[PDB]
Design a binder for these strands. Structure first.
Lengths: 540, 406
RNA sequence: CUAGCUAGCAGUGGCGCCCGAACAGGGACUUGA
């Protein structure tokens, strides 16, 4: 193994932590002895422990497929004192973000952790003893904190010459799998595979739809593994964890699959025999069946041709997106329904959706796709020109399909002749929570109504609500609290607080409306008047 | 070469912030430049032996089609400030903001010719991303002085002045200021004379192999624009309401402002569209407020120790306003920016703002942009044409600043 | 160090407890109208 090693260091002001090997039983020694002699005669573990004052814990267990007992080494105290190392692995790939490889194959190298050496200076921290006799690791040991990082670094450093010799071979490396493919003939494909096998054997490496972490990769397409669901009544805690994992791994690709019914029905359950009781769970699982009755099939990304995106609203602040390159040949689908912010509306959610989609396209495909938005050009330009923030989207076009994305109402910047003045205000004590709300008019048609368990903001909201309730066709309203100003000027359609929702539902039927703002407690028109009218026994 | 020993500060480690994704078209230029920079010995590949990581992105520089790479050293600079701040720093002259012309220059090629300390290279490790996370990150490590970390000019200024002395002696009126990799020149001559002098300086810098191809700014056109009020014969109730609101807000800025006479005309509860006769007393107070407004707000100094804050807002149709202040309501400099896509204009505005603050005071001010975090974080690499990264955040604006201007 | 004198691994994915880090809502301190 003439491969170059990696310089390894230790945390400053630290050293090898000693361990007091627990005296174990006897029905686990002979196997340990035979296995350490077997690993010693291979030349990857040395036994030089004459004066080394260090020790590491040793364990043994018989796992599934019981044929023999194997050794186990732990570093619960060694990895803690070991300096931190960079972790290159930070995400997961996507099946749709692949290419079209006619001659595709897979390859994995098992037990390759022994085929990589370790720094001789760092080998001082591999005190592996057993009742005595001590051994020292000479290769990368299992369970090491920096084992996968060093392994993948060595893998890349050893396959880079093969990439230099043949840059026209698409290679998708991983922890141990080597997803290699190209567009060559079967003979040329086998020749390249044999050349790669010889290249790995140069350093002594074992060279022996598809499966990719549960995915299905066909030569001409790709799809998700068809999941199933048991049809029993009881569900143990193991069954619970398993089914919730299945539905979580299925909801990431399929739409309309949620976990609110199982989350709400599986609260506080820490037992194993607990038989959770309902019709809601039954209908949710039947919908999951119906959706999983027909499997979806994606298409590999084509680098030559571009790709188009589109989004269609489904109702109740839920929006689904599609990514495609050819008509009806969609790559992947999904859903976006997060209520970002207290007050949201149509174009704000559309901007959030398009930014999420372009971020996904950057992280998956590394480019920006064209968008087919179901909205008009002049509406969007008026919106972003008449907004107090900065919102920009890439090039797009219009598609005629319900439901259309429009604005339920608009606003003005100057009063209208024939309107009526409306000075509104209202507050309550910080302990009684019993406040009122009124207003004034030219003709003198005021109206005060008390409230119960309300805050000043909600008092002003109720005041403007009752103002717009008995108003004419075109009225103007002036207030003082900038909170209602910011709420109304944003022009929402769906908010968390239903109060503003009923307010906008009452205002939308009105043709025109104008808003203003005046500093309170300055005697401006009817502000101080309504303040004195509503402050009866709440001011002093 | 004897590299100056540079160290970090105890208690804080190096930067370990993640790297946002990029586009494959940018990855092409990234590979095509890092291969050359590694063949030139400026960088070298490393492994996972160092957990420190700093993001890297690329821009499309003007005057050519190259893709100059840059590293956001915000964390490194924020953690090593004290070194270049008290150990070896450079003061800020005041004569450059009174000249006629100024030309921006880059001297990164000079930084690319000096080795860096070996014990410090483990903190400037930069990594490039990969598409679909298939190929692991191709890590690298700097071997020369990088661009973005303000310690490299702090340690290079010696040789910089040593090289610029032979030609700056015959030109006593010239000014040289290098807060970062950028380079500004102070000249109060005509456009032709400034052109000749700047091409002479280009020759002087290329004498040592410096490939150097907004560009020419003017500091004399920077006047303080205070709050302006409308003056029309028609005075509706809405107009006087907006006026009293604006002046009640500005009372924190202008102390000697009252609402005595203005609060009398609007006392009668009436409608809004009607016109009210403006009395001479309210007219006198309005004229007083007008003549006080044009006077610059006194008492606003410049603290060379505290930080800077430069808020920016958007009015519409490109009407970008901006205010700079070290303390709330203690504005130091205002202005306007309009008549230049929705993010390109914002990037140009923040670029102009930070350039003016650098050539005036010499300190990158913190920004408050009125934009969502994810959108700008993903689209700020489109039209960015600078070489360093400033500090910023994401805060909304109240519904009052929209009435600060027309 | 943990679990009932005795037994006591790690990584990957998942659903479950506590704390910290970001967004949104209620009280105290300070400064002015």
């Amino acid at each position: 193994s003439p491969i170059e090693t990696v310089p390894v260091k230790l945390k400053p002001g630290m050293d090898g932590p000693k361990v007091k090997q627990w005296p174990l039983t006897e029905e686990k020694i002979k196997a340990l002895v035979e296995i350490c002699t077997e690993m010693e005669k291979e030349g990857k573990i040395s036994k030089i422990g004459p004066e080394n004052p260090y020790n590491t814990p040793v364990f043994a267990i018989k796992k599934k497929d019981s044929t023999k007992w194997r050794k186990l080494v732990d570093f619960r105290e060694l990895n803690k004192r070991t300096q931190d190392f960079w972790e290159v692995q930070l995400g997961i790939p996507h099946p749709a973000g692949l290419k079209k490889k006619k001659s595709v194959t897979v390859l994995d190298v098992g037990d390759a952790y022994f085929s990589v050496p370790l720094d001789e200076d760092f080998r001082k921290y591999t005190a592996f003893t057993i009742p005595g006799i001590r051994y020292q690791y000479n290769v990368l040991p299992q369970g090491w904190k920096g084992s996968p990082a060093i392994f993948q670094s060595s893998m890349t450093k050893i396959l880079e010459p093969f990439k230099k010799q043949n840059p026209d071979i698409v290679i998708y490396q991983y922890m141990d799998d080597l997803y290699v493919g190209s567009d060559l003939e079967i003979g040329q494909h086998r020749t390249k595979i044999e050349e790669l096998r010889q290249h790995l054997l140069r350093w002594g490496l074992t060279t022996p739809p598809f499966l990719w972490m549960g995915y299905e990769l066909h030569p001409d397409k790709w799809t998700v593994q068809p999941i199933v669901l048991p049809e029993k009544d009881s569900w143990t805690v193991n069954d619970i964890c398993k089914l919730v994992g299945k539905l979580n791994w299925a909801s990431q690709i399929y739409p309309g699959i949620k976990v609110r019914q199982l989350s709400k029905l599986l609260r506080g359950t820490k037992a194993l025999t607990e038989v959770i009781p309902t019709e809601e769970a039954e209908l949710e699982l039947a919908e999951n069946r119906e959706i999983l009755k027909e499997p979806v099939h994606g298409v590999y990304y084509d680098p030559s041709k571009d790709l188009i995106a589109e989004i269609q609203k489904q109702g109740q602040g839920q929006w689904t997106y599609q990514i495609y390159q050819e008509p009806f040949k969609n790559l992947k689908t999904g859903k976006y329904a997060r209520m970002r912010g207290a007050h949201t509306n149509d174009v704000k959610q559309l901007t959030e959706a398009v930014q999420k989609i372009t971020t996904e396209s950057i992280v998956i495909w590394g480019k920006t796709p064209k968008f087919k938005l179901p909205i008009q050009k002049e509406t969007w330009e008026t919106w972003w020109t008449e907004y107090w923030q900065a919102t920009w989207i890439p090039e797009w076009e219009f598609v005629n399909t319900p439901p259309l994305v429009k604005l339920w109402y608009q606003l003005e910047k100057e009063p209208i002749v024939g309107a009526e003045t409306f000075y509104v205000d209202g507050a309550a004590n910080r302990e009684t929570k019993l406040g009122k709300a009124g207003y004034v008019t030219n003709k003198g048609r005021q109206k005060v109504v008390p409230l119960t368990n309300t805050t000043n903001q909600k008092t002003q909201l109720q005041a403007i609500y009752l103002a717009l309730q008995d108003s004419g066709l075109e009225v103007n309203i002036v207030t003082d609290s900038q909170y209602a100003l910011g709420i109304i000027q944003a022009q929402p359609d769906k908010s968390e607080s239903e109060l503003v929702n009923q307010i906008i539902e009452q205002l939308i039927k009105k043709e025109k409306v104008y808003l203003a703002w005046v500093p309170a407690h300055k005697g401006i028109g009817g502000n101080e008047q309504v303040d004195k009218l509503v402050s009866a026994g709440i001011r002093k | 070469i004897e590299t100056v020993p540079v160290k970090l500060k105890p208690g804080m480690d190096g930067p370990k912030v993640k790297q946002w994704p990029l586009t494959e078209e940018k990855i092409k230029a990234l590979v095509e430049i890092c291969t050359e920079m590694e063949k030139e010995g400026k960088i070298s590949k490393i492994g996972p032996e160092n957990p420190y990581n700093t993001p890297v992105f690329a821009i499309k520089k003007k005057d050519s089609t190259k893709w100059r790479k840059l590293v956001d050293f915000r964390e490194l600079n924020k953690r090593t400030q004290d070194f270049w701040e008290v150990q070896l720093g450079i003061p800020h002259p005041a004569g450059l903001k009174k000249k006629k012309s100024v030309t921006v220059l880059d001297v990164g090629d000079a930084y690319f010719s000096v080795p860096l300390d070996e014990d410090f290279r483990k903190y400037t490790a930069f990594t490039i991303p990969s598409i679909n996370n298939e190929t692991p990150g191709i890590r690298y490590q700097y071997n020369v002085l990088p661009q973005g970390w303000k310690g490299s000019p702090a340690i290079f200024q010696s040789s910089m002045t040593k090289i610029l002395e032979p030609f700056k002696k015959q030109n006593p009126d010239i000014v040289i200021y290098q807060y970062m990799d950028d380079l500004y020149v102070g000249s109060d001559l005509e456009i032709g004379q400034h052109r000749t002098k700047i091409e002479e300086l280009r020759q002087h810098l290329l004498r040592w192999g410096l490939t150097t191809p907004g560009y020419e700014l003017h500091p004399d056109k920077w006047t303080v624009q205070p709050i302006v009020l409308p003056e029309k014969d028609s005075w509706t109730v809405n107009d006087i309401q907006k006026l009293v609101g604006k002046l009640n807000w500005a009372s924190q800025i202008y102390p000697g402002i009252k609402v005595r006479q203005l609060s009398k005309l609007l006392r009668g509860t009436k409608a809004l569209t009607e016109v009210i006769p403006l009395t001479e007393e309210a007219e006198l107070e309005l004229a007083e407020n007008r003549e006080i407004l044009k006077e610059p707000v006194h008492g606003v100094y410049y603290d060379p120790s505290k930080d800077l804050i430069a808020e920016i807002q958007k009015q519409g149709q490109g009407q970008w306003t901006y205010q700079i202040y070290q303390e709330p309501f203690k504005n130091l400099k205002t202005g306007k920016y309009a008549r230049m896509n929705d993010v390109k204009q914002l990037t140009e505005a923040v670029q102009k703002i930070t350039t003016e603050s650098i050539v005036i005071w010499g300190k990158t001010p913190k920004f408050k942009l009125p934009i969502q975090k994810e959108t700008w974080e993903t689209w700020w690499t489109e039209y960015w044409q600078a070489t360093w990264i400033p500090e910023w955040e994401f805060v909304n604006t109240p519904p009052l600043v929209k009435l600060w201007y027309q």
